[PDB]
Design a protein around this ligand. Structure first.
Ligand SMILES: CC(C)CCC[C@@H](C)[C@H]1CC[C@H]2[C@@H]3CC=C4C[C@@H](O)CC[C@]4(C)[C@H]3CC[C@]12C
Ligand SMILES: CC(C)CCC[C@@H](C)[C@H]1CC[C@H]2[C@@H]3CC=C4C[C@@H](O)CC[C@]4(C)[C@H]3CC[C@]12C
Ligand SMILES: *[C@@H]1O[C@H](CO)[C@@H](O)[C@H](O)[C@H]1NC(C)=O
Ligand SMILES: [Ca+2]
Length: 1251
């Protein structure tokens, strides 16, 4: 029967699996056992769909004898299917076994070759990202433990409305409180508050066990809701030290973790590109452009040659080609394109009559001219040369749709279809002549040439989303139905809704709000109930990983291809054209300031925001008189030395700010109020008087010059999508407070609202016709709504508000249109993913081609320079072999090999014992673990005082690791000493022993040490983000921070501008992108400000501030990331198979034990074991040392030394030159003169090394 396994069976089975997938798509879940007829038919169909697979699996086993992989997966799903069918038929378990129906499409996808190839590539790229998966696992442990020690159950009190126990009556957001003698949020006015409260968010988010605090740390690492946890641990424990946790976790675990991932991925992509460029795949596209380029001019030359004549086109063709390409024709077609985009853009909601008439009349008035232009350009270049151009076909489709829309104009449907927008791609005609437009054509060229691979990757990602949506609706289908009044729309009811929810979780936005619903639906916080968070965690991790692997591989590969194609094709432009002649022609003062200016900056930072009269703003009110005169005196001393450069103008302006703001008088409500803000230019004075700062600033400005093209393209697409969305949601996003009214006229007066859906507590509210927070009435409003969508903040609300829109000036209808989610999906895919990852890839490839473009073409490729420099900087190390007999014994006991395993397990059980402190622990449990902790302290002390007598009291302090362990130990015994009696601080050191255990491992140490040395190598890139934070903190503090701390808005006791640290925290929260739009709304003008300050408070500057800050912060962080990545790029792409510094390090570590001191004196017989202990890659394998290896080692000319006086550098260089780059005899002087040409100075230290 192994003859029907041919094509028909394969395609038949693929069709069966596809039909099974669609059957699962339809299935739809119902709350609590309900079902319609479709579910009563699909359960019948999924018996034939099981018999087919059973028949398939029955023949293969007795035909092929299960170990093929995907065959095994098919077998598991089949056997689970039969077991499920038997159980369902015999029981009248359903949840358990209908889940394998999502494993079924996996077996589907493992039938297509070029999807299996893509998955293999993804899995091969996943392998290097395992150390940076271990370090992310050993941070959510070290910080979970710390959270266990600090916030164990401290967040269980809440206001209770003293007058009876009742049930937590305190606003519609129960928040922790304190006992006054405590340090949290007092309920103040009455309302005494007592323990016995589930938790801040139903008990799912709290530091109680090692499970609820190994999820709270994960949420604060994915940055989606870390401020909400910070506030909950803030107003429950105090506001003094809860930030050193929640900011040191995100500047160590969410940026220095997202940095390594990007670096490794970029390195792997570059390495793969270099490995794939050798086959010559770039040549085919390289030869494709010229073959296409040299066709149009060949054809039109042939075309116009026929027109010159040897039937009466003596006035047609002459004014056909020389009139559509006659300059003015173009430059006026551009004018008409601008007219069309103005016509379509100049529309809003509730337009005037004249605008509606004119923008409707001009449509066809321009369409007729452009349709004529079609033909006028058609018979000029003919049909072949017209249709060959890809961009010509774009305008072809645009005009076709324009003359086509007068059929569906009868019943709107597409409305005035947003096709008139898409014509502004012909406004890039003006862009045509702009700098590097012949890379934008190359951009789309590459993105369309690699379209097959792009589509395969996108299809694999889409299949992943589909599978995790089917499983999502199987798990949480019809279970998000609680008695709570609201009807949360992030459910898993249908397939479109499940897809939208999965897409929302995949982009991170509110991924922790669906997780809480999933946990509360499957029981609650418990052992079996709180296990469904695994679904969301795996979804997030895998989705983000695949998003990176798709949208960054596409960007990096295609953009590097385009850049290389440009730099290799426009290069020959000169060598071909310019040869037109070839045929024919043939510090004290600087300190004295850098101190004063920065101290003035910190003086202007620590002011009093909210108060206009105080002592801090009087000490710092009259502080600036020493500064202002000495700052002005610098100009006076320097002015007469000359008679003007650039930064001196900035100096003049920053000093004239004080020179004028001292006086002004008169109108003391303005002008002083802008020069008060204009004092944020004092720090910028230091940019000129400090070298290196100019270097980094100029680098950033040249980066602006490089990425202006991408920025302009992104903003043009923003304008385009805003224009399409205007004709789609123009005024349809209105709603009333009462859902029973759907008209502004009807939505008036009062109506009854019931508290918490209780019919016995009616409260009168007014009726208000309120527009959405982010509407689409005009182009400008859509430009902000789409920006907020692209920031992945608040976009689900916009999606589920626009879904309910049906008609203009009418109320919403539940799920009126679900196909409108495609607009947001396409916008997120194209702008929020493609055009941002293309930005990042452009920066990465630009920084990678710069630098190493130094062209160190003194031969000596990029391994031997490092090998030679390491050979030069080398010496035998120190071993410290102890004397005095018994000291050698103690050192041997310490320096044993299997005692290290004992020392590692004594830490492994220490962390496990420490990480069991739950809440409400049995009294005996605490003391039982306390004595165990004391025993661990005793045993570790024993180890330290055993190492002291072994390594001598000197070497115990040399290695930082032993010093670090000593510091940890001595801070552990005195904790036991104070246990007889601050305390919270001293319980913490054991996590440092844990992080040492983390540090164990060669790969972890190499990666981390290299990245830290790279970060230290560039300290002038962090003093750009620091400057930005300083300037915007001061600006926002002076402008927007005077408002009252109203707990009902997004400005409260924790989020405000009323102090510099709090302003910095607010800017940090906006930088991480938590609620920046909400803070911008809260900074809108008309908010009542503090009564202590003498509703006019607020400003309209909020939009500019909170948009410019976000964009600039993103740019600066990306610049820092790319700088630190490209400083270590040499390590990132190394091909460890070839010789590397690690081999030399291990060679040195083996060699050092044979020399009591550094010296350089060796023995002659140690070579016998040296040739055996060298690694087979570095040296020789398992061959006998007394062989050709020794023969060639002695054959070469060693330096003229004694039997054993050869130095370490000489033999190391001999080994490295025999391993790689072998040369014939007589080339020793060639190496001698080469090492003095490009290599660094030897300082005449190779006198003996010459021979
Ligand atoms: C999605 C891929 C990994 C395949 C599906 C595997 C998962 C989703 C399936 C396979 C085994 C299933 C479990 C098996 C048994 C039961 C016991 C029942 O009283 C509650 C559901 C529960 C606990 C199932 C939940 C879903 C489950 C964990
Ligand atoms: C996401 C896929 C790929 C891998 C992870 C499998 C997930 C879906 C599985 C693994 C463990 C499973 C849980 C194990 C135990 C229980 C308790 C039971 O009373 C209800 C089902 C529930 C809550 C299961 C739900 C499904 C579950 C969370
Ligand atoms: C300010 O707070 C008071 C008391 O909590 C509240 O009544 C009022 O509505 C708040 N105003 C704003 C604008 O938040
Ligand atoms: Ca968010």
């Amino acid at each position: 029967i192994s003859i029907v396994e041919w094509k028909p069976f394969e395609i038949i089975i693929l069709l069966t699996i596809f039909a099974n997938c669609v059957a699962l798509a339809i299935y739809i879940p119902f709350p609590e056992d309900d079902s319609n007829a479709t579910n009563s038919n699909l359960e019948r169909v999924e018996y034939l769909f099981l018999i087919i697979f059973t028949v398939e699996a029955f023949l293969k086993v007795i035909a092929y004898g299960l170990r093929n992989g995907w065959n095994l997966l098919d077998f598991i799903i089949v056997v689970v299917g039969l077991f499920s069918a038997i159980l369902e038929q015999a029981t009248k378990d359903v949840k358990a076994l209908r889940a394998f129906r999502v494993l079924r499409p996996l077996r589907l996808v493992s039938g297509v070759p070029s999807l299996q190839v893509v998955l293999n590539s993804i899995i091969k790229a996943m392998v290097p990202l395992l150390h940076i998966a271990l370090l992310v696992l050993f941070v959510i442990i070290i910080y979970a433990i710390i959270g266990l020690e600090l916030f164990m159950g401290k967040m269980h009190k809440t206001c209770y409305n003293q007058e009876g126990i009742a049930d937590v009556p305190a606003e519609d957001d129960p928040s922790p409180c304190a006992l006054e003698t405590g340090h949290g949020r007092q309920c103040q006015n009455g309302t005494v508050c007592k323990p016995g409260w589930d938790g801040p968010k139903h008990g799912i988010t709290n530091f109680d066990n090692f499970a609820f605090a190994m999820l709270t740390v994960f949420q604060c690492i994915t940055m989606e809701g870390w401020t909400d946890v910070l506030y909950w641990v803030n107003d429950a424990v105090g506001r003094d030290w809860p930030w050193i946790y929640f900011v040191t976790l995100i500047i160590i675990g969410s940026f220095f973790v997202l940095n390594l991932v990007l670096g490794v991925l970029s390195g792997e992509f570059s390495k793969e590109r270099e490995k794939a460029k050798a086959r010559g795949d770039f040549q085919k596209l390289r030869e494709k452009q010229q073959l296409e380029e040299d066709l149009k001019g060949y054809l039109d030359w042939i075309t116009q040659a026929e027109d010159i004549d040897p039937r009466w086109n003596r006035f047609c063709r002459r004014k056909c080609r020389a009139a559509v390409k006659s300059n003015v024709f173009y430059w006026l077609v551009i004018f008409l394109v601008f007219l069309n985009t103005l016509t379509i853009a100049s529309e809003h909601y509730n337009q005037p009559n004249w605008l509606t008439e004119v923008q409707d009349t001009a449509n066809k008035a321009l369409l007729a001219l452009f349709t004529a232009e079609m033909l006028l350009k058609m018979y000029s270049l003919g049909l072949q040369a017209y249709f060959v151009s890809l961009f010509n076909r774009f305008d072809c489709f645009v005009v076709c749709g324009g003359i086509l829309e007068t059929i569906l104009v009868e019943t709107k449907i597409m409305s005035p279809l947003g096709i008139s927008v898409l014509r502004c791609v012909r406004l890039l005609r003006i862009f045509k002549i702009t700098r590097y437009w012949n890379s934008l054509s190359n951009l789309v060229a590459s993105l369309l040439n690699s379209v097959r691979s792009i589509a395969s990757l996108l299809l694999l990602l889409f299949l992943f989303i589909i599978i995790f949506s089917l499983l999502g609706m199987q798990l949480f289908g019809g279970k998000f139905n609680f008695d709570e009044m609201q009807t949360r729309r992030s459910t898993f009811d249908n397939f479109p809704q499940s897809l939208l929810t999965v897409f929302q979780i995949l982009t991170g936005e509110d991924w922790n709000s669906v997780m809480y619903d999933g946990i509360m639906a499957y029981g609650g916080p418990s052992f079996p109930g709180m296990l469904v968070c695994i679904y969301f965690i795996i979804l997030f991790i895998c989705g983000n990983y695949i998003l990176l692997n798709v949208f960054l591989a596409i960007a990096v590969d295609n953009l590097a291809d385009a850049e290389s194609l440009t730099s290799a094709q426009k290069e020959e432009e000169e060598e071909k054209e310019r040869k037109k002649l070839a045929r024919t022609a043939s510090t004290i003062f600087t300190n004295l300031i850098l101190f004063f200016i920065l101290l003035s900056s910190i003086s202007l930072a620590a002011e009093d925001p909210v108060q206009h009269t105080s002592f801090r703003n009087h000490i710092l009110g009259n502080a600036d008189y020493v500064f202002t005169s000495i700052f002005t005196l610098e100009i006076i001393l320097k002015m007469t030395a000359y008679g003007r450069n650039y930064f001196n103008i900035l100096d003049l302006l920053v000093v004239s700010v004080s020179l004028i703001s001292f006086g002004i008088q008169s109108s003391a409500i303005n002008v002083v109020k802008i020069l008060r803000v204009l004092r944020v230019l004092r720090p910028l004075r230091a940019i000129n008087r400090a070298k290196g700062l100019k270097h980094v600033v100029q680098c950033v400005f040249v980066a602006i010059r490089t990425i202006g093209n991408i920025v302009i393209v992104t903003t043009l697409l923003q304008f385009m999508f805003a224009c399409i969305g205007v004709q789609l949601f123009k005024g349809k996003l209105y709603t009333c407070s009462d859902s029973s009214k759907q008209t502004e006229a009807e939505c008036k007066g009062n109506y009854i609202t019931y508290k918490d859906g209780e019919v016995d507590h009616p409260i009168i509210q007014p009726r208000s016709w309120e527009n959405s927070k982010f509407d689409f009435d005009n182009v400008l409003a859509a430009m902000m709504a789409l920006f907020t969508v692209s920031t992945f903040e608040g976009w689900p609300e916009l999606l589920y508000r626009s879904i309910d829109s049906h008609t203009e000036d009418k109320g919403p209808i539940y799920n009126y249109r679900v196909e409108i989610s495609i607009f947001f999906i396409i916008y997120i895919i194209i702008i929020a993913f493609f055009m941002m990852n293309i930005f990042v890839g452009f920066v990465i490839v630009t920084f990678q081609e710069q630098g190493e473009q130094e062209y160190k073409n003194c031969e000596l490729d990029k391994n031997q320079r490092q090998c030679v420099e390491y050979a030069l900087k080398a010496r035998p190390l120190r071993r410290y072999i102890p004397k005095n007999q018994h000291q050698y014994k103690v050192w041997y006991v310490v320096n044993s090999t299997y005692f290290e395993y004992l020392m590692f397990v004594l830490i492994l059980l220490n962390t496990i014992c420490l990480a069991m402190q739950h809440y409400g622990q049995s009294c005996l449990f605490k003391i039982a673990m306390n004595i165990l902790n004391m025993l661990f302290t005793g045993l570790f002390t024993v180890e330290m005082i055993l190492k002291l007598i072994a390594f001598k009291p000197k070497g115990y302090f040399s290695d930082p690791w032993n010093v670090f362990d000593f510091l940890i130990v001595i801070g552990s015994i005195i904790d036991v000493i104070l246990s007889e009696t601050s305390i919270t601080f001293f319980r913490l050191f054991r996590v440092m022993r844990l992080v040492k255990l983390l540090s164990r491992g060669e790969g972890i140490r190499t990666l981390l040490w290299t990245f830290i040395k790279s970060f230290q190598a560039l300290p002038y890139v962090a003093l750009l983000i620091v400057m930005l934070f300083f300037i915007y903190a001061v600006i926002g503090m002076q402008v927007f921070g005077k408002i009252a701390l109203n707990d009902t808005t997004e400005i409260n006791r924790n989020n405000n501008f009323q102090t510099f640290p709090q302003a910095v925290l607010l800017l940090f929260r906006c930088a991480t992108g938590e609620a920046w739009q909400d803070i911008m709304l809260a900074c809108m003008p008309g908010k009542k400000c503090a009564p202590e300050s003498e509703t006019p408070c607020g400003s309209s500057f909020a939009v500019f501030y909170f948009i410019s800050f976000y964009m600039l912060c993103a740019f600066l962080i990306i610049n820092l990331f790319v700088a630190v990545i490209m400083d270590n790029f040499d390590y990132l792409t190394r091909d460890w198979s070839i010789l590397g510094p690690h081999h030399l390090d291990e060679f040195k570590r083996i060699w050092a034990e044979y020399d009591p001191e550094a010296k350089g004196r060796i023995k002659h017989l140690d070579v016998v074991t040296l040739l055996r202990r060298i690694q087979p890659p570095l040296g020789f394998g398992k061959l006998c040392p007394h062989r050709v290896a020794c023969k060639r080692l002695v054959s070469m000319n060693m330096p003229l030394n004694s039997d054993g006086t050869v130095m370490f550098n000489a033999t190391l260089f001999a080994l490295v030159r025999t391993a790689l780059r072998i040369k014939t005899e007589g080339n020793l002087e060639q190496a001698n003169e080469e090492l003095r040409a490009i290599i660094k100075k030897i300082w005449k230290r190779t006198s003996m090394k010459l021979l």
